[PDB]
Design a protein around this ligand. Structure first.
Ligand code: X4W
Ligand code: NI
Lengths: 327, 328
């Protein structure tokens, strides 16, 4: 029920603020953790409308969210579940979609594009290492947080539980689709995402899509032809890197691990060559945060049990949120 | 205890020196930290004169100082409080008000104006990050330290605890006001500060105001028309930058995050583009300073305890002051 007088609604330990987007089966709201003051996004999924396959899908998608732990992939902090509703407490990326940002402010200088594209490549390679391929990239998958860091959203999930939902299924994906789709060839390997990453890099450095169609038919023709315009300001090294991604034969595209050695990717990072991401082991014995949580009224044995099992309960969420920047 | 009949008095660990200014409810003095020798400013507020809501304004403004931790914003070092009096120990900007400097020396060359305006834009955008919008940004908020670095004072504050008469807040603010002030609508968004930042930029590079008049009607006329002189010496890039700030329609006024990318803002900083300020984590583990404080008589335990929570007490003040340039 009501938490405080004349206050916003809550769910668990979170104050629910503005709705960011609403869909068929899911809503997303901005929210503030009551205990720590940290800002979060909460995806709200009505379970009463889902059949068993939808439910079992939803469950394993949530489990994938728990497995993926990368600085540029939207991170899960807490799960709250009622009989009728599942709430997923996750990172909030205040600056919205990358392609919307590029439309608004124009192309990124190559230095800034390199910064975001290193983040994109690292995150997607890490998903590929874990055998998660998306094959459905669109602008919605790429977000920016308040520090202009890339946060990849919904990678490897179905759009059944997005705010676009079943209705907007096709609006955003054709510009990123690999030519194998329209040739009638297989469309399930990481090569597909590699092509899409080439489209993404083009949009970062040019502000535009490399294959632009007045409709589905013209977009298909350009994708199958594989030719795209090199702008006068684009560096030769950038142009050569695009050649690693936008290859018509999927067998001849470079793997992401190979492309990580590319010259343009590593300009300005001579002693910092991009390499496959290695998860650090999570520190679950930060006595400073543990003591704060005792102060919040949790017992140290409760804390130890929640962290050691990684339950995505209210304690592990607090501990993780205490490790992030406040306000 | 006393310091002697003909010596300057002390409060806590500070010797009280010359008065910089006095207001209805506050006095500001230059002071010297006894333990480190560092120069500071002390704001002395007589609480016995304050009703409870003026008291809360006072405490609100203290909270704001503790929130704002930026190298071009006046920083709080220590709080001393009795039943009757509140002492706020803070940074001292030994070169005074930007307004006075401009009048004494004339306009800054664009290279020197650029270094200051980067500091100003950084500080104000940082304040906006903290959801602190001033809406009274004017020359009196802008001070200079010994190294000619900008230090912003009173951002987010009322006038209750400033120096001068009660009717001094209005002296400097109209020429910096956004045109929305004169159109009967809301006057509360970050865009208001953005407009004032354009006026500030103009005064740095020209030495005068872009909008003026001999009364409020005349000033309103000039602000609403939005036109202003471009001096012969002003670069085209500086002129183009001013156009991002001094836009009549607040909806179309440039945002600070995008203005930080401007060519003029970044000339001579090509590899070091201006970006939203990122507050670093305070280093509380500098053993060189800790060891110096044990030599003063502080125990290592009490130092550890005072620094773990930001206490604004004698210990944290000493630690921070040891991190600043010594007196010369
Ligand atoms: C800005 C202004 C003021 C006070 C006295 C004289 C002139 C202006 N002020 C206030 O109204 C109240 O709050 C303050 C707190 C600190 C400082 C300050 C720090 N360093 C310097 C160096 C020179 C002058 C002032 N200051 N000034 C103010
Ligand atoms: Ni309730």
């Amino acid at each position: 029920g009501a938490m405080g007088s004349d206050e916003q609604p809550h769910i668990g330990n979170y104050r629910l603020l503005k709705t960011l987007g609403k869909g068929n089966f899911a809503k997303v709201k901005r929210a503030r953790h009551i205990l720590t003051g940290r800002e979060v996004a909460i995806k709200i999924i009505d379970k009463t409308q889902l059949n068993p396959t939808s439910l079992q899908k939803l469950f394993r998608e949530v489990r994938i969210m728990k497995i993926l732990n990368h600085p540029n992939i939207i991170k899960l902090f807490e799960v709250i579940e009622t009989e009728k509703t599942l709430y997923l407490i996750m990172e909030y990326a205040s600056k919205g979609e990358v392609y919307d940002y590029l439309v608004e402010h124009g192309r990124m200088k190559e230095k800034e594009a390199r910064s975001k594209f290193r983040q994109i490549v690292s995150a997607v390679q890490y998903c590929h290492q874990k055998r998660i391929v998306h094959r459905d990239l669109k602008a919605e998958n790429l977000l920016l947080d308040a520090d202009m860091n890339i946060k990849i959203a919904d990678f490897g999930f179905s759009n059944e539980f997005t705010v676009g939902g079943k209705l907007d299924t096709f609006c955003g994906s054709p510009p990123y689709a690999a030519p194998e789709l329209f040739q009638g060839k297989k469309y399930d390997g990481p090569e597909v995402d590699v092509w899409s990453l080439g489209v993404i890099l083009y949009t970062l450095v040019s502000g535009s899509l490399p294959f632009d169609g007045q409709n589905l038919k013209e977009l298909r023709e350009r994708v199958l032809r594989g030719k795209y315009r090199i702008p006068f300001y684009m560096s030769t090294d950038c142009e050569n890197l695009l050649k690693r991604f936008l290859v018509l034969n999927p067998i001849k595209r470079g793997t992401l691990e190979q492309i990580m050695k590319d010259r343009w990717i590593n300009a300005g990072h001579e002693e910092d060559e991009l390499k496959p991401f290695v998860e650090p082991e999570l520190d679950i014995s930060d006595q400073k945060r543990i003591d704060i949580m005792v102060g919040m009224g949790y017992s140290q044995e409760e804390i130890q049990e929640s962290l050691s099992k990684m339950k995505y309960d209210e304690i592990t969420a607090t501990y993780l949120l205490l490790g992030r920047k406040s306000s």
